[PDB]
Amino acid sequence: MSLKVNILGHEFSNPFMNAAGVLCTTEEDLRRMTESESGSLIGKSCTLAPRTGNPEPRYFGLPLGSINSMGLPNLGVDFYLSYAAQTHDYSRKPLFLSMSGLSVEESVEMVKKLVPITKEKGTILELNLSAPNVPGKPQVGYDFDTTRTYLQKVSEAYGLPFGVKMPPYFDIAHFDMAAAVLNDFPLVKFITCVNSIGNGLVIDPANETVVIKPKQGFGGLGGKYVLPTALANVNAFFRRCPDKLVFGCGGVYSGEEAFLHILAGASMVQVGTALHDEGPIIFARLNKELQEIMTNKGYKTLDEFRGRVKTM
Amino acid sequence: MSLKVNILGHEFSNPFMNAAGVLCTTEEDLRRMTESESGSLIGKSCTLAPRTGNPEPRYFGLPLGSINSMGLPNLGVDFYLSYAAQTHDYSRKPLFLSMSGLSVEESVEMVKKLVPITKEKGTILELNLSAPNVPGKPQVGYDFDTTRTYLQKVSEAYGLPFGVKMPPYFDIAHFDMAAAVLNDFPLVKFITCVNSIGNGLVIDPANETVVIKPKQGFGGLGGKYVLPTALANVNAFFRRCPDKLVFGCGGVYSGEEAFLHILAGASMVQVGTALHDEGPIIFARLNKELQEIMTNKGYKTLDEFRGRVKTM
Numbered sequence: 334m335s336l337k338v339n340i341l342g343h344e345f346s347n348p349f350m351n352a353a354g355v356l357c358t359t360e361e362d363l364r365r366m367t368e369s370e371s372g373s374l375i376g377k378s379c380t381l382a383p384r385t386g387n388p389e390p391r392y393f394g395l396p397l398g399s400i401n402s403m404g405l406p407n408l409g410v411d412f413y414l415s416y417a418a419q420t421h422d423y424s425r426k427p428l429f430l431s432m433s434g435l436s437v438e439e440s441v442e443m444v445k446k447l448v449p450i451t452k453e454k455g456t457i458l459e460l461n462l463s464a465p466n467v468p469g470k471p472q473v474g475y476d477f478d479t480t481r482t483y484l485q486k487v488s489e490a491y492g493l494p495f496g497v498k499m500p501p502y503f504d505i506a507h508f509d510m511a512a513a514v515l516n517d518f519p520l521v522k523f524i525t526c527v528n529s530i531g532n533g534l535v536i537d538p539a540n541e542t543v544v545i546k547p548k549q550g551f552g553g554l555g556g557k558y559v560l561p562t563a564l565a566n567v568n569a570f571f572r573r574c575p576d577k578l579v580f581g582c583g584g585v586y587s588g589e590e591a592f593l594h595i596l597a598g599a600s601m602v603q604v605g606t607a608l609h610d611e612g613p614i615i616f617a618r619l620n621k622e623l624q625e626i627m628t629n630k631g632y633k634t635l636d637e638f639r640g641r642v643k644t645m
Numbered sequence: 646m647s648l649k650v651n652i653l654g655h656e657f658s659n660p661f662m663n664a665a666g667v668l669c670t671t672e673e674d675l676r677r678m679t680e681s682e683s684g685s686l687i688g689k690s691c692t693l694a695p696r697t698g699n700p701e702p703r704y705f706g707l708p709l710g711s712i713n714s715m716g717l718p719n720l721g722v723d724f725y726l727s728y729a730a731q732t733h734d735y736s737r738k739p740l741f742l743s744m745s746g747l748s749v750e751e752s753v754e755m756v757k758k759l760v761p762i763t764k765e766k767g768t769i770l771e772l773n774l775s776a777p778n779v780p781g782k783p784q785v786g787y788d789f790d791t792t793r794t795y796l797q798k799v800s801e802a803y804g805l806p807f808g809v810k811m812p813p814y815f816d817i818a819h820f821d822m823a824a825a826v827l828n829d830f831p832l833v834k835f836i837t838c839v840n841s842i843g844n845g846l847v848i849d850p851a852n853e854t855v856v857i858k859p860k861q862g863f864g865g866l867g868g869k870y871v872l873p874t875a876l877a878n879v880n881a882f883f884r885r886c887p888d889k890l891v892f893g894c895g896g897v898y899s900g901e902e903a904f905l906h907i908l909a910g911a912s913m914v915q916v917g918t919a920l921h922d923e924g925p926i927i928f929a930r931l932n933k934e935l936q937e938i939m940t941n942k943g944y945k946t947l948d949e950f951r952g953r954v955k956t957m
């Protein structure tokens with residue numbers, strides 16, 4: 334009754350990891366993910382130099398999910414490389430790093446340093462082309478000319494299999510255009526769909542005020558607001574990019590929702606808002622709920638239903 | 646104590662109307678909207694020739710809203726033009742017509758036909774630039790050069806103040822570019838934010854099957870899913886297009902969501918998924934629920950709080 338995932342030469346005990354930026358900024362945070370029942374983990378979307386991020390308040394838990402304008406608070410690339418080279422326990426689970434250079438020049442600089450650590454430890458790169466909360470910096474995934482420039486430059490520079498965190502698309506034409514770009518880059522081996530539904534706004538009727546400080550209350554949305562969007566993006570790139578893997582991210586609160594992600598195409602399944610609400614104990618119950626579902630449906634591996642959602 | 650809205654030279658008895666697509670396709674639909682307590686109504690987004698729309702099933706109610714790929718079912722432009730000129734009762738309330746020609750050429754011909762009915766009767770145009778459910782037709786709203794052409798050409802052929810139904814944007818640079826375009830066209834008097842979050846995917850875990858037939862199950866999302874997005878968009882255009890009104894659309898089930906929309910800058914508040922659920926008696930309930938909120942807060946009119954959302 335296997336939850337195992339076998340990708341890029343690595344063995345994963347189950348399909349579940351943290352969403353980049355939830356429980357992964359500090360050494361303490363990464364330790365707790367390692368010690369959880371998650372199949373893998375990913376470090377914070379990091380920058381060349383350390384950042385403190387946006388001013389406070391910048392996070393608000395919502396009845397149907399979360400809004401945030403974090404602003405890439407991170408200990409800089411040298412801290413996470415160090416964690417990846419010296420500290421992390423690989424015999425426990427593989428490690429993804431997320432990198433979110435604010436310019437292609439910056440991203441080139443950071444991936445060049447990761448090359449020898451990937452070689453020795455097999456650390457996996459997820460390149461972030463979303464990042465919706467940095468004031469003044471637009472999401473790269475929404476500019477297909479600039480996306481091409483990043484993939485080009487990171488491909489040449491990194492010279493090894495990597496992945497990409499994509500912003501949500503909401504138009505068939507966009508799915509097609511994103512696809513035509515990604516498929517010109519054979520080193521892009523996986524696509525994470527999706528990041529926060531960007532630039533939403535929550536207002537408190539009681540004091541008639543926005544609930545976060547940065548960018549006049551505008552922040553990225555997560556949780557139940559995003560499942561339909563996430564499922565669609567995973568499925569759309571599963572069909573359009575068959576030489577690549579899809580990782581699902583968005584709206585995972587339970588095993589049911591993990592199951593729908595896999596059904597739409599997902600190899601690995603990331604958890605953000607639910608993980609932030611419940612703590613890493615969630616992984617233990619996500620593993621048991623997905624097993625229950627597969628047991629009831631008579632599925633022995635993830636592979637006999639991955640991508641096999643039925644249409645009418 | 647008053648809910649009156651004074652815009653476009655017109656008096657509206659309240660700010661509430663139907664969203665385009667909902668209870669507005671047939672003569673009975675439009676009579677019922679007209680006999681409702683709604684401040685206004687809008688006809689179904691029409692085309693030059695009649696359409697029966699996508700194959701069934703094409704609408705699926707959800708706990709947190711709705712998913713749909715209706716496909717612009719409509720009795721053709723001539724039907725709605727005839728309704729506006731001969732049937733509708735303008736003493737009861739003003740009328741909008743939504744027009745969604747599928748090419749600039751189709752739209753131009755349609756808008757010309759309205760000119761003499763607007764002049765005679767005062768019928769208002771909402772140019773629809775976000776039809777996400779017609780197979781193989783991208784949402785115009787997401788192409789700014791295409792959007793420009795539509796607005797140029799409708800400005801030339803129509804030559805009277807009109808409005809636009811926008812798709813939701815999720816990037817600040819997209820808000821900037823949308824507004825730069827809109828601000829070159831002074832005949833554009835109002836911006837309706839927002840249309841459905843396009844191309845979501847719902848899968849029923851029981852049968853592993855999508856819940857809608859068209860486009861492999863991909864459809865637009867209404868209801869609770871959309872409220873954060875609707876508010877942000879409303880407020881973003883409110884700030885960036887100060888010489889235009891903003892109309893609010895998305896996630897409105899009650900007095901409170903109506904209050905939020907207005908607070909973020911909305912003049913009129915359109916109601917979709919909730920009106921589908923409840924039928925036209927929801928307009929009576931929204932009038933009452935909004936008056937309660939205003940009474941409790943000490944407000945006598947909408948102008949006390951419209952656009953007065955507070956930041957930190």
Ligand SMILES: Cc1cc2c(cc1C)N(C[C@H](O)[C@H](O)[C@H](O)COP(=O)(O)O)c1[nH]c(=O)[nH]c(=O)c1N2
Nearest residue numbers: 352353354378527528529555556583584604605606
């Ligand atoms: C507090 C917090 C912080 C971050 C995020 C989210 C939240 C809630 N997200 C987005 C996250 O990775 C995920 O894609 C979304 O939250 C959607 O997943 P859920 O719906 O929340 O499960 C995020 N994504 C990313 O690529 N890098 C990051 O540094 C962050 N930071």
Ligand SMILES: Cc1cc2c(cc1C)N(C[C@H](O)[C@H](O)[C@H](O)COP(=O)(O)O)c1[nH]c(=O)[nH]c(=O)c1N2
Nearest residue numbers: 664665666690839840841867868895896916917918
């Ligand atoms: C059945 C149905 C049909 C349509 C729609 C919706 C639904 C549910 N919508 C979108 C609608 O106008 C509105 O923008 C969204 O539904 C968001 O509002 P709610 O959250 O649903 O209130 C829509 N919009 C539009 O401009 N013209 C249309 O013909 C339609 N058709």
Ligand SMILES: O=C(O)c1cc(=O)[nH]c(=O)[nH]1
Nearest residue numbers: 715716717776778841865
């Ligand atoms: O008729 C439809 O399918 C339709 C039109 C539109 O503008 N938006 C939507 O969600 N559906």
